[PDB]
Symmetry: C2
Subunit: 279 residues, 2 copies
């Protein structure tokens, strides 16, 4: 028993976003992980009403200090960040990422959670701070809206997404997975590399299951991470993750929540249902 | 797609106690549940340093109100409480439990977490408030220390445990599962009923860590939810728990993630003895 993953993201008491998605997925894959919360909310922000508060910086610091002093994060090989309610937590997380990476190799997946479908669901201060946090990541997983924000470019096509990714690669980010780009009633995912000598950029086209969930992206992030941790090459890890996500969505009745509890037995599916098209 | 369980208890970022045990176990049984936290701590209280804070009453209220107004608790059939850092949250929970039960049938398992091995690990104000909370429960799961604290009786034997249970049954509590009693060099679990006309008290002799009890609570609850009679549910839960403990290296944390495939174990290893 040693902790392999540290993941810093939101929590909801009911339903499935952020670190609650993280918990279900990483538990099911039996990947021992630390789940540091950035919120304690009743439910996600889609509902008629929300209750609860974001985690305060002093408490976050107290937690991260406790993990370090008790050696509970000594053996972490992977780091994830997701939703932050305030920029002070983002900047503190940067400080912690720097320290974590200072004496060991840690693969940091930053899911730059800011909004979806053209619209932000984060504070404007958080957006700016996120432009700094992503610079420290090994891989980032923006949706098109998040990419557009992070770069100031429009992202309404694969061609546009490639141009925007390039801005971020120039800042040093090695790998960018753009998780949803709208094309007709298909969604396109793009995996873009800074080093296109030794890696090939690719896309995956999938049909749209007419939907809603922010838990969609969050679920994708953790399934993808799990397979990366299990040693599956990235192309294949992405194909598994999106494939499993599509199975989840077909098995989802409402649009309030992704049906992730009931699909736990299917989370480790190895089906790679889609075609990887290189650029 | 509806929440069946509401569980209100502690949270740790690393390791397994309280609602974190609750999540792993209820998730693995695919029982859709609401997990309201009462703390957000780095790690359990076994370590020299315990970063993070207890949940504040205002936030707790805001959470509970949101669940209610969004109808996310409308279809709850089971309620669990565990650890509370402060009595204000206990008294608010009592308000919530009264409302939930006044207009629907909800089975409330109260794990009256106060302490273990003679010693409290809760604030004194929490003890007093817990004596009130338990009065609303359908079943309570004290250990012998907790039972002794809740009644003022010594609990060093089954016969003593029965006398203590009787105090609490007279307050209305229907079922009391006393989870460990040190009788000589035996460890005995007792299930005592207020209604001994329609139910038979029993004991289970069992062989001799931080989230052990919490794991029992949730496996037990899961089998009750799956429709297993209480005697069998208890035997399964203690059988599975011990499997987890026996396959745990060292004592800092229970090996619950590696044991996920065994959480739905149906072995009933021990002997039920009616008393
Ligand atoms: Mg997202
Ligand atoms: Mg206990």
């Amino acid at each position: 028993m040693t902790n392999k993953v540290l993941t810093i993201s939101s929590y909801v008491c009911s339903g499935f976003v952020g670190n609650r998605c993280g918990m279900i997925i990483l538990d099911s894959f039996q990947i021992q992980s630390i789940f540091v919360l950035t919120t304690h909310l009743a439910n996600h922000t889609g509902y008629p009403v929300v209750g609860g508060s974001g985690v305060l910086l002093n408490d976050f610091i107290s937690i991260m200090d406790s993990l370090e002093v008790n050696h509970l994060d000594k053996d972490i090989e992977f780091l994830v960040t997701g939703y932050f309610p305030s920029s002070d937590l983002v900047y503190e997380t940067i400080n912690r990422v720097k320290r974590i990476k200072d004496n060991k190799k840690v693969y940091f997946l930053c899911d730059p959670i800011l909004g979806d479908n053209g619209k932000m669901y984060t504070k404007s201060e958080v957006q700016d701070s996120m432009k700094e946090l992503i610079k420290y990541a090994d891989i980032i997983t923006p949706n098109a809206t998040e990419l557009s924000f992070l770069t100031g470019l429009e992202v309404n096509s694969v061609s546009e997404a490639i141009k925007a990714c390039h801005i971020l690669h120039e800042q040093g980010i090695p790998v960018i997975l753009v998780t949803s780009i709208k094309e007709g009633n298909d969604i396109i995912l793009l995996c873009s590399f800074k080093d296109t000598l030794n890696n090939k950029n690719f896309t995956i086209k999938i049909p749209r299951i007419e939907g809603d969930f922010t838990g969609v992206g969050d679920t994708l992030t953790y399934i993808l991470l799990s397979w990366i941790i299990k040693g599956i090459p990235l192309e294949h890890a992405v194909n598994r993750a999106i494939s499993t996500l599509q199975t989840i969505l077909r098995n989802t009745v409402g649009t309030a929540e992704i049906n992730i509890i009931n699909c736990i037995p299917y989370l480790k599916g190895t089906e790679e249902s889609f075609t990887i098209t290189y650029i």
